[PDB]
Each structure stands twice: as C-alpha cells, then as structure tokens.
C-alpha cells in the first residue's frame, strides 16, 4: 500500500510518499525532470545519445590488441585512460552511503551504524503487495526450483578466460575481509566494521585479537615451523578463536586473522603466504630502521601489505578478470586532481554478486591427488602433507569454473546458493531490472535476452512469468557471458564500481598517506609499487614457483 | 634520542628516522624541497609573496562595512566568497585523519580506532629530552604558577564583541556533543564516536539510550509537563543514566541525550529547547505525512535538526564570533564542484582551544537573582522556578567574558584550567609556535608579541625563558586579541578549519543527502534553510522572547 511500491521514480530520482495514495519524485540532480523523472534535460539528451553501450565498450577493450599495445607504452596516455576508469562511474556509488536493509529512506541510523551492509537500492517496503513491489505473484518461485533448474552444475563448465585455483582462492581470501556476515544479527549485517581492505583477515578485526596474533618482536606475527616451513600459530598458543569442527587435532587448529580461514586449505595457503609476507617486510623495515621498535615495525608493515593487496587486486586480479589488453594501474595520484571520497561502506549487493561459487571445481587437484569437498573441507593436513610449493604449482594448473552462463554451481555448496536466493528475498532486494536501471543498463526485455539461449530461459519463464520479476542473484549466474568471458554484463557493470570504490577509497590512497614516509621511506613505498601475485609467491614460497591467475 | 625530536621538517614535511642519529624529511606535495623542506619551489615563492597575513585579512573583513553591504546583496558574489571561506583552508586538515596521542606516525590503528581524538600535530616522542622536543628545560613551568600568574580572573573582563550567556551556553551545549572525553581511557580518548554534529547530545550516543528517550509515538521524544511547560523526562521514568550528585531529588533528575547536561541549568535550557524543537518538527512532518510511521518521523526530524544546528552555527554563531560584515552562509551546494571529503575526525587540539571558560561570569543573573557557581551547578530547580522564557530573556541580557587577552578564567573552575595545562602535557602537545607554523602562521618571536602588553609577558618569560617553549593552551587565553575582539589570531586561525570541517563534513551536506526528500520534502527542507537562533527560541519558548548571541 506504500505508494512508492512500484518504484515509479526513474533515473535515480527518489520516491517519497505525500499522503496515503500519492507520491512525489525528487529529481534533484538526476539530469531529468517530470513526475517520474523521465523527461531528459537538453544536456542529458546529448550525453545519452553520445554514450556507447557497455557491450560496445567491452568490445573495444578486448580487441585492437595492437592499438592497446601502443597505449600501454605511453605513460601519459595509460594514466589518462586509467584515470577515466576510476572516475567515470563515481556517480554510481552513494558515498557517504545511504540505504540499508532496514531503511528505504536516508536516516542517521542508516548512515552511522557500521554493523549494516549498505544498500545500492533501498529495500522493497514491507507492506508492498508483491515481493518485487507491485509486479509478479504474491510469492516468488520456489528457490529450490530455481536452484535446480538453472543454477546447479551438471557437467563442469570451465572458465574460458582460464581462471585457475590461485585466482579462485585469492578471490575467496581477499573478499572475506569485507564480506563477513553477522548471522547473529541477520544477512544485512557485517562484522567487517572497517568496510574495506584493512587486512583484518590477517591481523584480526579487534585489537585484542591482533595482539594475540603478534610476536611483539621486530613487528612480526607469531608463527610456527613445521618441517622447516613457516606456518601460522595454533589456537592453543595464541588463544585466538577459530571455527573448527570438534574432531580437528589441536596442532592443526591454525589461528589467523579471519576465524573461518580453517575451512579450506586454499584459504590457509593464502593466510600462510601473507603471514610470511608480513614478516618479510618486517625484516626489510628493520634493516632500514634499526632504531624502530616493535610497534612501528608492525604498523608500517601492515600499511605496506594493504598497499600490496590493492596493487595486486588492480593490476593482476582485476586485470585477469577484465580480459582487457589495456593494462590497468594502481596509481592513487590519478585521483589527486579529481573529486573523490576517501571512504567506503560495503554494500549488500556487492556481497551478493561476489558469490562466485561456480569457480569451484568438482575436486581439488593437488599434485596427483583429487580431493572431494568432504576430504578437502577443514583439512589442514593436506596443506602440511603437500606443502605450499606443491599447492601453488597445482592450483596454478587447475582450471576454475565459469560463473555466468548458467548451471555451474557445484552441488557440494547448493545450500549456500539456496541461501543466497532466500536471503536476498529476506533483505527485500529489488528486481534484476531495477538493479540494471540503477547502474545505467537497459532492462532485459525477455528471459532469452538474459540467457542468450532457449532452455534455461524457458524454465525461468515458467517460474517467473515476467522478466521484470527476475531476481538479481540467479540472473547473474544464468546471464549470457561476454564472448568467451567469465561474466555477463550485469556482473561487470554492477560490481566494478563497488570494487574500485573499495580499493581507491582506502585511506592509504589519500594524498596525506600516499607518500614514502607513510611506508618507512622509499624502500617500503617500492614494495607496494612493485608488488604482484608472482612476486608475492616468489618471495614467500620455497623454490619461487611460477604462478599467475590463468592456467598456462 | 629520536632524531625527529627537534621537529626539523618545516612546511608540513614529515620527519622519519633513518637510523639512530639521522632523519629524513618527506617533502612530498609540501611545495618545498631540501633537507628540511625549506627551499620553496617557484610557484610557492609566488603565492607566498601574494598571500596577505591573517591580521590583514581580518582588517578587511571587519571594515569597509559599506562595501560588504553590497557584496551581501549580490547572491552570486556572496556565494563565491563563502565558497572560498570553505575551501581556502581545506588543506589545513588531514582528512582522512592521521596522528593521535599514541601515534606520531601514520598507522592503521590510528586511522581506524574511533575511540581516539585525532591530532593535528603528532605528539612529541616519549624519549625526547625535553617536553617540547629539544628546546626548554627538563620540565615545563609549574602549571599552578602559569594558571595563577596569567590565567585566573582578578576582575571580570567583559567580551568587547558583546557575547551573552545565550552564546556561551550554546557553545557549551553544541560542542559537548563531540567533546566527550573518556576519562576511563585518558584525555586523548573520546566517547563521541560520531566525531561530529550527530546530535547525540539530544538523542543519545547509543541505540539503547535513544530508545529509552523516545516516545515511539509520532516520532517524538519523551517529555513531561510541569506547570503547563514541556521539560525532559526523568531518570526514574526512563532509566536513562545521568550524572547527578547524590542529593538531587528524583523528579529533578532530568534525562537528556548527553549524560552531563544536568551540570548546569544553562545546558538543560538548551536541552529542553531542542527537545521541544524535535517534537515540533514531528508535528510538522506528521501533518505532511499522515502515512508515515513513528520511526520515519523520528529519523527525518533528527536529520532536520542536524541541518538546523549547522545552519544556526554558521549564520548566527560563527557570524557573531567573526564580527565580519560579510554574511556567512550555510549552503552545501557551494562544495558540489569542489574537492572535499565528507567526513570528520575530532581533533584533540580542537577540543583544547574550545576551552572557552573565560566566557563564564562570576554569577549567573536570572531575573533579579544572582546565582553563584555553587548555587547554579546541578540545580534544575532554578530552571523550573524561572522557566525558559525568563532564562532566555535573562541570558540574552547578561554579558560573557573575554576569552583572549589574559587573566579571565573564573576561579570557580581553576581546576579545569589547570587540568587543560596538565593534560596537554600528558598528551605530549607540541609548542605554541609549532602549532602556529602548522597552520601557516608566523612564530611569535617574544612573549610581548604574544600578549601585546608587558606585565603578563614578563611573567611568562620568567617561567618559560624561551618563546619557542610557550604552550598552546595558555597562549590562547593570554594572547593579544584582535582589535576589540574576543579571540587572538591563533584561536581563529587554528580553530576555524576544524570548525568548518566538522560542519560541512557532515553527510547531510553531501550531494546525495542535500535534497528535499531526505528531509520529508520541501517543507522539512525549508526548516533547515530558514533556521536561526531567534526562530529556534521563538517556536519553542513561550511568548517568543527576543534573543541573540550578543547583548542588546
Ligand atoms: C570485463 O570484466 C571485468 C570484470 C571485473 C571488473 C572489470 C572488468 C573491471 C573493469 C571495469 O570497470 N571496466 C569497465 C570500464 N568502463 S568504463 O570505465 O566506464 C569506460 C566507459 C567508456 C569507455 C571506456 C574506455 N574507452 C576508452 C572506450 C576505456 C576504459 C573504460 C571505459 C573491474 C574494475 N572489475 C572488477 O574489479 C570487478 C570486481 C568484482 C565484480 Cl563482482 C565485478 C567487477
Ligand atoms: C574572526 O573571528 C573568528 C572566530 C571564529 C571563527 C571565525 C572567525 C571563523 C571565520 C573564518 O574562518 N575566517 C577565516 C577567513 N579567511 S580565509 O582564511 O577564509 C580568507 C583568506 C584570504 C582572504 C579572504 C577573503 N577576502 C575577501 C579577502 C574573504 C574571506 C576569507 C578570506 C570561523 C569559521 N571560526 C570558527 O568557526 C571558530 C570556531 C571555534 C574556534 Cl576555537 C575557532 C573558530
Ligand atoms: C573453496 C571452497 C568454498 C567453500 C566450501 C565455500 C562455502 C561457503 C559457505 C558455506 C558460505 C556461507 C558462509 C556462512 O553462511 O557463514 C560462503 C559464503 C560466501 N562465499 Fe564461499 N565457499 C568457497 C569458496 C568461495 C569462493 C572461491 C568465492 C569467490 C569469491 C566465495 C565467495 C563467497 C562469499 C563472498 C560469501 C559471503 C560471505 C559472507 O557474507 O560472510 N566462496 N561460502
Ligand atoms: C557553564 C558552566 C561550565 C562549567 C561548570 C564547566 C565545567 C567544566 C568542567 C568541570 C570541565 C571538565 C569536565 C571533564 O573533565 O570531564 C569542562 C570541560 C569543558 N568545558 Fe566547560 N564548563 C562550563 C561551560 C563551558 C563553556 C561555556 C564552554 C565553551 C565552549 C565549555 C567548554 C568546555 C570544554 C570544551 C570542555 C572539555 C570537554 C571534554 O573534553 O569532554 N565549558 N567544563
Ligand atoms: C545497529 O543496528 C542494529 C539493528 O537495530 C542494532 O542491533 C539491535 O540492538 C538491540 C539493542 O540495542 C537488540 O535488542 C537487537 O536484538 C539488535 N538487533 C539486531 C538485528 O542485531 C545494533 O545495536 C546497532 N548498533 C549500534 C552501534 O548502534
Ligand atoms: C582503541 O585503542 C585503545 C587504546 O589502545 C584500546 O583500549 C585498550 O583495550 C585493551 C583491550 O583490548 C585494554 O586492555 C586497555 O586497557 C585499553 N586501553 C585504553 C587506554 O583504553 C581500544 O580497545 C581500541 N579500540 C578498538 C575498537 O580497537
Ligand atoms: C570501432 C568500433 C567497433 C564497435 C564494435 C561494437 C560491437 C558490439 O558488440 C556486441 O554488442 C552487443 C550489444 O548487446 C552484444 O550483444 C554482442 O555480444 C557484442 O559483441
Ligand atoms: C544436477 C542437479 C540437476 C537437478 C535435476 C532436477 C530437474 C532439473 O531440471 C531440468 O534439468 C534438465 C536436465 O539438465 C534440463 O534439461 C531442464 O531444462 C531442467 O528443467
Ligand atoms: C508515472 O508512473 C505512474 C506509474 O508508476 C504512471 O501511472 C504515470 O502515468 C507516470 N507519469 C508520467 C508522466 O509518465
Ligand atoms: C584429510 O586429508 C588427509 C590427507 O592429507 C586424508 O588422509 C584424510 O582422509 C582427510 N580427512 C578427511 C576427514 O577427509
Ligand atoms: C636542517 O635542520 C637542522 C636542525 O634541525 C640543521 O642542523 C641543518 O643545518 C638544517 N639543514 C638545512 C639545509 O637547513
Ligand atoms: C538551588 O536553587 C534554588 C533556587 O531555585 C535555591 O533555593 C537552592 O538553594 C539551590 N540549591 C543549592 C544547593 O544551592
């Protein structure tokens, strides 16, 4: 009965009720006017007419390899293009943040309470007649129905971009510092109060936890040596709380910043590499600063590791994801003459579309073994038996699954995929096409346009009837991918703004932080500005095995 | 022994130790280069040579009243100047913030731990040979000595700008939402985790406290009616914790957002006015929105009162303090085409220089009574006996004390002034002249230049010997005022950047918040944009008594 239930305001105008059965659209600064903010202003007609489609742009970025080769080798030109990449979409992220699961209007509670994920689109009001607002049936289609017909893997569909398990586990490890749902409160709540790349998954969310992980000598983190190899300490040594099944022996209860990282040895692998990396930087900083104490060595190392992470995510991780020939660049100075907010609030929808479980293989292939999920989960003895070098060599070779294109979620984690559907609904997510409009994309006009094929589309059309009732999460997983790409348009276009905002919004990218002395001088600064996935593994994994985010 | 103890880097360059007895200055983006960042670049020589002094600017802003009268009546010209006021100094405040009492270098702990006040200048390192670094004696002069010789009031010195008790209590009430020192942790720690104008002094710092204060009808706050007049509820009714001496009767233990506001009836007066204003706005919003619930009425009213507060502070409160003929303006749109960070972290030094206790009179004169401090403190029966109208009429007529110029701290609060000295030292504040340099002011070259007279200057010279060892806090209260002004140059030039940053950095000034629907439509928006101290009192105090921030 809320008069705004039909989402009547277009072009990011805001709907407000003006009585029981009337509404008003606030078209302030949308570029549009009129009752529903649908009449474009003159300057808006022009730019709309001159704006290429995302699929047109994606074509240009993935072709003309020779032209892009020239651009990359002209620092001024590459800088200019990367600068546009960073600012072109800032208008798409509300910063400071606005809505959350409990607030469809702006409020001081929504702005100030950091325990919420923020929301790119307000929730559908509780009293709306249908889950998507006014369209569709009283209830959305059975989520198990949707799961089985279009989401579950039949046969493994490999990623055509060649993502490997180093990438898959890097994505899982990296994202689990800011996707940390507080299930004691609900799916719209997080425990990552830093709301970004603070490396709490290495150092701990709280000071108490951090101090239990620290050696308090030379800035270093505690560690144990097993078979000549450095691994994280135990729960017994540190008193750090970790999530482990009751049968895990004490000497295998490794303690790391993130309490769930004992769930899979792929995560413990990266937890071990980054712990080693922190202590390596401690040695470097102590050599440069014999006069420094333990506290300053730890803090400066932490700042450098934050920088390395952002460097790797942009220039290796996103670079791989994009398939662009243009070489992305981590350069905070590109924003110094630009309007940009050095802050971030993690959006629920960003969490939702980062649910890349189709990446997971049917078995995890380390050396000559092929572990099933049951053997793999919560089993750190695999990491000790094979070691990090063999983990890297094996995971560099093993292909990851395709995420878009449908029917590639391994049934081992079908409960998680069903929870993504159920809890998206619980959080009153708007429809896929509302989210498409919110990120300047054309609404899909049929299920076949969404999938690009006929069979999944037909199953989805029988379940949903109307395309405007299609839900965001399943749509991402069934969407037609870009040509030979891992993702469809919606994933890239909705996820990229959150992603870059979460990286460039970090305080170390602000002008007063982005200078050598923040990082202990030019030597510490250079560790950030030369980091890579290859060198991260090379400095911290015995034998310096080759690695990358794609197979071969 | 720290090689940076002498603060060798000038012009906001950063000092870093490079060994036990060597340092390096990071001159990045300071406009200077060289070992100590003292060699100006060419563009810097130019702007330095074209920059008027703050006392020259102050002269122009307080004279040529005829010319300023023309500027004020040209909206485009007034906007352009106000825009410069807001941004001209943007650069003086580290945002995102940097140092705090425990960190003289940038660290993730210092960035992320909101329980700290931030620091405009890093603390003097613990191992420096002298309290100011390397200058001065082993110990700073006896704080009792300083207090008695140059700070304590002999005879009441009135403010020549005519500040009254409406102003002094507005300053106390307003600032005590973000100056809330956590004495359980130490002077460098705050309990105002919002770090700004969130009106927690009305609504409570925590949700638990806010909900005990709320009526949960029509968005309103709980209240009682005493003699036909609306007052805050009691501790007994609400269970809201308040600080009161044991002898206060239960029916006089008024409960308000800020737990210390029973300290003086001057605070409870404003607590009551703002309580009435919140519920007044609730009535207005309910009339515009019969379809709204209690929660949306409460949240929208709170946002409007935040807007009213900022409006009043800029256009009435700062306007009065400045003595400018130019009319300052609260207009968030002025920053929309400007680089600006919509965030704020409350600085310790901002707290320190807002210690305006010389404002206080020797007695509080309400109607025909003259209450001493002992009679006035923790005595809400005074507020009930006279009522709000008589409070307003009396406090509008009573003159406040001059803040700069020396010897005007009332003896009733001498323990507070001595604590300001002692805790500035505990927090390892740098010297007055270091803070002057940090805010682009010339160091004082003698005590007589600081005070502008001879007797206090000689007093201080016997205590401190060297001017470069003079402390920030005593200097503000003994400083030579501007001609017939309440403050000296240091107070204004250091405090104005923090002040405007805390006001404009608020999220409601950001583009996505600053639009009518955030505030329930044009009617709620208009409440912000027409607010004034006079209308605040007129709508909420019986009889609409005249008020202002100056006498007569
Ligand atoms: C492809 O696959 C991907 C996949 C993921 C991607 C990206 C690309 C990108 C790059 C991007 O953001 N790509 C659009 C640039 N479009 S653009 O800047 O608006 C633009 C518009 C018009 C012309 C342009 C242009 N010219 C000169 C034609 C050059 C460059 C940009 C132009 C980022 C950040 N990803 C994420 O990290 C990310 C992480 C997690 C999730 Cl879930 C989702 C994404
Ligand atoms: C006077 O007493 C006061 C006292 C307190 C004041 C102010 C003025 C000011 C106004 C301001 O900030 N005054 C600098 C103007 N100048 S610039 O630096 O803005 C500038 C530079 C060069 C030329 C200019 C120019 N033209 C036309 C030549 C026009 C306007 C500005 C120009 C504000 C905010 N304070 C605080 O809130 C306040 C709150 C608590 C604390 Cl303890 C301390 C301060
Ligand atoms: C390798 C084996 C993996 C397993 C066994 C697994 C399993 C799970 C489970 C059970 C959850 C629900 C968490 C909870 O409710 O407490 C979850 C959530 C999630 N998964 Fe995975 N996952 C794996 C890999 C990945 C990968 C490769 C990604 C790629 C990005 C990913 C992305 C996510 C995200 C973002 C969440 C949300 C976490 C949160 O909100 O706290 N996962 N996963
Ligand atoms: C009217 C009677 C006033 C009394 C009795 C009074 C008393 C005090 C006392 C005892 C403190 C120390 C409290 C503590 O350490 O926790 C204090 C702090 C303070 N007072 Fe006043 N004061 C009054 C008015 C003012 C006024 C007019 C201002 C002007 C802005 C002001 C600004 C401050 C500030 C900034 C602090 C430091 C607050 C903090 O860190 O928590 N006070 N006052
Ligand atoms: C942030 O918001 C959540 C949601 O309202 C708050 O959590 C509630 O807190 C109350 C007590 O104040 C509990 O009775 C509820 O059970 C909590 N609900 C949920 C869903 O957790 C939380 O307290 C807020 N945090 C802050 C810092 O204000
Ligand atoms: C912010 O920093 C303060 C100061 O280090 C932290 O307070 C300390 O917390 C430990 C336990 O973690 C106590 O043993 C100390 O007594 C506390 N010291 C002081 C001076 O309060 C505080 O925990 C930090 N806050 C966060 C959120 O990490
Ligand atoms: C030099 C300019 C060349 C521009 C090439 C444009 C190619 C557009 O490319 C096509 O766009 C469609 C839009 O939906 C997609 O459906 C197709 O898959 C995509 O390949
Ligand atoms: C691996 C999990 C499969 C769940 C089977 C339940 C019914 C699934 O459903 C059907 O699956 C068929 C075979 O793939 C498809 O051809 C149909 O389009 C689909 O509706
Ligand atoms: C605006 O939208 C409503 C339904 O959402 C529609 O009935 C109305 O006619 C629209 N108005 C205009 C001018 O398009
Ligand atoms: C854990 O992995 C080891 C190999 O390192 C294997 O022998 C064992 O069976 C696994 N445990 C479970 C419960 O699968
Ligand atoms: C820099 O300052 C130090 C002391 O702080 C001084 O000894 C040195 O001569 C200065 N160097 C220059 C180039 O001015
Ligand atoms: C409190 O104020 C009343 C006047 O309202 C006065 O009679 C009483 O003496 C005061 N109490 C104290 C303890 O001073």
């Amino acid at each position: 009965a809320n008069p705004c239930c039909s989402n009547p305001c277009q072009n990011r105008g805001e709907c407000m009720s003006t009585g029981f059965d009337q509404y008003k659209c606030d078209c302030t600064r949308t570029g549009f006017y009129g009752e529903n903010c649908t009449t474009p202003e003159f300057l808006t007609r022009i730019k709309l007419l001159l704006k290429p489609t995302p699929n047109t742009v994606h074509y240009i970025l993935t072709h003309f390899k020779g032209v892009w080769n020239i651009v990359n080798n002209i620092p001024f030109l590459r800088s200019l293009i990367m600068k546009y990449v960073l600012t072109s979409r800032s208008y798409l992220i509300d910063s400071p943040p606005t809505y959350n699961v409990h607030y469809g209007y702006k409020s001081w509670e929504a702005f100030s309470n950091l325990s919420y994920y923020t929301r790119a689109l307000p929730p559908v009001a509780d009293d709306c007649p249908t889950p998507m607002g006014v369209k569709g049936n009283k209830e959305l289609p059975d989520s198990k129905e949707v799961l089985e017909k279009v989401l579950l893997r039949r046969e493994f569909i490999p990623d055509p971009q060649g993502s490997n398990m180093m990438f898959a586990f890097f994505a899982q490890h990296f994202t689990h510092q800011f996707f940390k749902t507080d299930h004691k409160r609900g799916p719209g709540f997080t425990r990552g109060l830093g709301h970004g790349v603070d490396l709490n998954h290495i150092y701990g969310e709280t000071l108490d936890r951090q101090h239990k992980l620290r050696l308090f000598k030379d800035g270093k983190l505690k560690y144990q040596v097993i078979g000549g190899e450095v691994y994280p300490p135990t729960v017994k040594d540190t008193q750090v709380e970790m999530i482990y099944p009751p049968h895990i022996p004490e000497n295998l209860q490794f303690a790391v910043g993130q309490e769930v990282f004992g769930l899979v040895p792929g995560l413990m692998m990266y937890a071990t590499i980054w712990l080693r990396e922190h202590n390596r930087v401690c040695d470097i900083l102590k050599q440069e600063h014999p006069e420094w104490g333990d506290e300053q060595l730890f803090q400066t190392s932490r700042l450098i590791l934050i920088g390395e992470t952002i460097k790797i995510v942009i220039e290796d991780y996103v670079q791989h994801l994009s398939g662009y020939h243009f070489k992305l660049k981590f350069d905070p100075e590109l924003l110094f003459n630009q309007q940009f907010q050095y802050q971030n609030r993690i959006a629920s929808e960003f969490n939702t579309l980062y649910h890349w479980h189709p990446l997971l293989p049917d078995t995890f292939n380390i050396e000559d073994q092929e572990y099933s999920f049951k053997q793999f989960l919560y089993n750190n003895s695999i990491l000790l038996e094979h070691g990090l070098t063999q983990f890297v060599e094996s995971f560099t070779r093993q292909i990851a699954g395709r995420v878009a294109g449908g029917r590639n979620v391994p049934i081992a984690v079908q409960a998680v995929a069903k929870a993504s559907i159920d809890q998206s609904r619980e959080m009153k997510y708007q429809s896929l096409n509302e989210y498409r409009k919110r990120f300047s994309l054309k609404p899909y006009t049929s299920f076949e346009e969404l999938t690009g094929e006929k069979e999944m589309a037909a199953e989805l059309k029988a379940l949903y009837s109307d395309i405007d009732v299609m839900e965001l999460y399943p749509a991402l997983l069934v969407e037609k991918p870009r040509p030979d790409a891992i993702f469809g348009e919606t994933m890239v276009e909705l996820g990229a703004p959150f992603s870059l905002k979460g990286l460039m919004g970090n305080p170390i990218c602000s002008p007063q932080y982005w200078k050598p002395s923040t990082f202990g001088g030019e030597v510490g600064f250079k560790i950030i500005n030369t980091a890579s996935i290859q060198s991260l593994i090379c400095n911290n994994v015995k034998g310096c095995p080759f690695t990358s985010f794609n197979v071969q």
Side-chain angles (χ1 to χ4, degrees), chain A:
Chain A
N2 190 315
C4 289
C5 281
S6 75
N7 316 299
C9 309
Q10 306 307 305
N11 300 312
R12 305 205 51 201
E14 297 178 9
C15 192
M16 174 187 62
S17 54
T18 61
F20 283 105
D21 284 302
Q22 327 206 10
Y23 68 86
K24 169 92 170 62
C25 291
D26 189 347
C27 309
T28 298
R29 286 183 291 281
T30 63
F32 295 77
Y33 58 102
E35 188 194 352
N36 296 328
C37 315
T38 60
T39 306
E41 294 162 7
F42 184 70
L43 215 67
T44 303
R45 302 187 194 264
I46 291 180
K47 51 182 292 178
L48 251 46
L49 191 145
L50 298 181
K51 198 218 169 200
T53 78
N55 289 341
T56 297
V57 177
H58 183 84
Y59 184 91
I60 303 172
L61 289 168
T62 54
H63 293 74
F64 315 101
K65 181 166 171 304
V67 186
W68 286 115
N69 214 285
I70 325 295
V71 169
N72 290 335
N73 288 317
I74 304 168
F76 157 74
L77 214 41
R78 178 181 177 212
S79 283
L80 189 59
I81 293 185
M82 186 61 199
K83 192 199 241 90
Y84 178 78
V85 172
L86 297 176
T87 54
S88 68
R89 59 271 278 69
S90 56
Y91 79 96
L92 257 4
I93 308 294
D94 287 342
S95 188
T98 50
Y99 314 106
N100 67 27
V101 59
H102 286 156
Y103 291 97
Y105 52 94
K106 279 154 282 163
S107 65
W108 195 261
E109 176 66 15
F111 160 76
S112 69
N113 186 332
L114 302 181
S115 284
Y116 285 97
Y117 292 115
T118 191
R119 278 285 278 274
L121 276 180
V124 167
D126 284 340
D127 58 300
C128 295
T130 71
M132 291 307 161
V134 301
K135 293 167 176 302
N137 299 124
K138 192 88 166 142
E139 292 323 302
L140 284 161
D142 180 40
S143 60
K144 177 178 274 205
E145 225 52 33
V146 177
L147 172 73
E148 304 195 329
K149 290 181 174 312
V150 298
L151 296 187
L152 287 187
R153 170 178 303 164
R154 281 64 164 166
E155 175 169 348
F156 176 77
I157 299 167
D159 171 30
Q161 298 189 221
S163 304
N164 59 24
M165 291 311 292
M166 293 297 291
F167 173 85
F169 284 121
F170 191 96
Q172 192 191 8
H173 185 264
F174 166 69
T175 65
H176 281 40
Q177 73 194 285
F178 45 77
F179 302 140
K180 302 200 292 169
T181 290
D182 192 342
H183 297 293
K184 302 185 171 190
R185 299 181 181 278
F189 293 87
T190 181
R191 291 211 277 156
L193 300 187
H195 281 271
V197 189
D198 57 8
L199 272 54
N200 76 77
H201 62 331
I202 297 160
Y203 300 109
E205 180 66 31
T206 65
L207 190 59
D208 231 284
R209 186 174 178 91
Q210 177 209 117
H211 284 190
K212 293 163 144 188
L213 289 169
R214 280 176 55 180
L215 188 64
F216 292 100
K217 186 219 212 314
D218 295 348
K220 288 182 177 181
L221 295 161
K222 292 163 68 56
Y223 64 94
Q224 57 182 318
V225 180
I226 303 171
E229 293 290 306
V230 164
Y231 291 98
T234 63
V235 170
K236 183 183 222 274
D237 171 30
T238 58
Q239 251 59 52
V240 161
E241 296 184 24
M242 295 288 297
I243 292 176
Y244 280 111
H247 67 279
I248 299 310
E250 292 185 314
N251 72 289
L252 289 176
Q253 291 171 36
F254 296 115
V256 296
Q258 232 281 26
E259 64 175 36
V260 306
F261 282 4
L263 153 93
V264 263
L267 291 177
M268 273 305 308
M269 181 194 63
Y270 273 113
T272 303
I273 294 169
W274 282 109
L275 164 29
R276 296 178 179 194
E277 173 60 13
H278 172 95
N279 288 352
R280 186 191 71 95
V281 174
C282 282
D283 290 330
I284 292 160
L285 287 180
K286 175 164 207 57
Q287 180 171 5
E288 299 299 311
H289 299 283
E291 75 290 2
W292 273 8
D294 168 77
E295 182 72 13
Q296 187 164 10
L297 289 160
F298 168 82
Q299 298 294 346
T300 314
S301 295
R302 174 173 195 166
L303 289 182
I304 292 171
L305 264 68
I306 292 179
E308 295 195 68
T309 300
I310 297 173
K311 169 75 163 189
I312 294 175
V313 168
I314 290 172
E315 300 192 16
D316 294 321
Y317 171 102
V318 177
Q319 185 72 48
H320 163 71
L321 272 175
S322 76
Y324 300 163
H325 297 120
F326 173 73
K327 270 179 160 82
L328 298 180
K329 189 187 170 196
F330 175 42
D331 187 357
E333 314 210 3
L334 295 174
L335 295 179
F336 285 172
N337 70 338
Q338 299 292 298
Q339 289 171 302
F340 185 84
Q341 299 303 313
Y342 291 107
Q343 58 180 274
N344 188 52
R345 194 75 60 86
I346 295 293
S348 202
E349 300 93 335
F350 190 32
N351 191 349
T352 290
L353 43 71
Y354 236 121
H355 279 58
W356 293 353
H357 296 102
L359 282 176
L360 297 183
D362 292 320
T363 63
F364 304 83
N365 304 347
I366 297 150
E367 202 168 339
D368 46 352
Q369 302 287 335
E370 292 179 354
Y371 301 101
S372 72
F373 277 78
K374 182 173 172 192
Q375 309 173 342
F376 197 63
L377 264 56
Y378 284 108
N379 195 343
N380 289 326
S381 81
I382 301 178
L383 180 57
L384 296 189
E385 190 201 348
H386 297 286
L388 273 195
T389 310
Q390 188 65 250
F391 255 67
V392 168
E393 298 174 319
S394 295
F395 282 157
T396 305
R397 288 186 308 255
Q398 175 165 17
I399 186 90
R402 186 187 227 172
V403 173
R407 301 183 164 162
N408 209 27
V409 175
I411 208 169
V413 293
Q414 65 170 329
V416 194
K418 192 186 188 291
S420 297
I421 296 176
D422 293 332
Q423 295 188 307
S424 308
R425 301 176 177 184
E426 246 207 76
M427 296 189 289
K428 300 304 298 287
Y429 274 26
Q430 281 178 55
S431 71
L432 158 74
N433 274 343
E434 292 302 343
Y435 277 101
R436 280 181 66 80
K437 285 186 280 185
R438 168 66 176 80
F439 286 81
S440 294
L441 309 177
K442 301 200 335 306
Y444 283 127
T445 65
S446 70
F447 290 97
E448 289 198 344
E449 180 183 18
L450 162 60
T451 68
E453 51 79 77
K454 311 208 166 230
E455 168 163 324
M456 286 180 302
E459 298 298 340
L460 290 168
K461 193 165 172 47
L463 295 160
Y464 289 87
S465 322
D466 190 341
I467 183 59
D468 287 325
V469 178
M470 183 56 183
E471 300 171 77
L472 166 61
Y473 163 77
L476 293 156
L477 274 38
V478 306
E479 187 169 43
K480 181 185 177 181
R482 263 66 177 280
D484 300 309
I486 190 173
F487 298 146
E489 171 189 52
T490 314
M491 180 78 82
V492 170
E493 288 297 317
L494 272 60
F498 299 114
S499 177
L500 295 174
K501 181 67 181 174
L503 298 161
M504 302 308 297
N506 192 281
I508 75 153
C509 303
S510 65
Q512 275 300 75
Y513 279 75
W514 189 249
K515 59 178 82 175
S517 53
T518 304
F519 310 109
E522 298 290 351
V523 175
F525 205 30
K526 176 170 183 176
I527 297 181
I528 299 174
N529 290 298
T530 60
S532 67
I533 187 60
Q534 173 62 95
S535 73
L536 182 67
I537 274 56
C538 184
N539 297 331
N540 298 296
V541 178
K542 185 179 194 179
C544 175
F546 169 82
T547 195
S548 107
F549 284 140
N550 58 269
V551 302
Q552 286 162 8

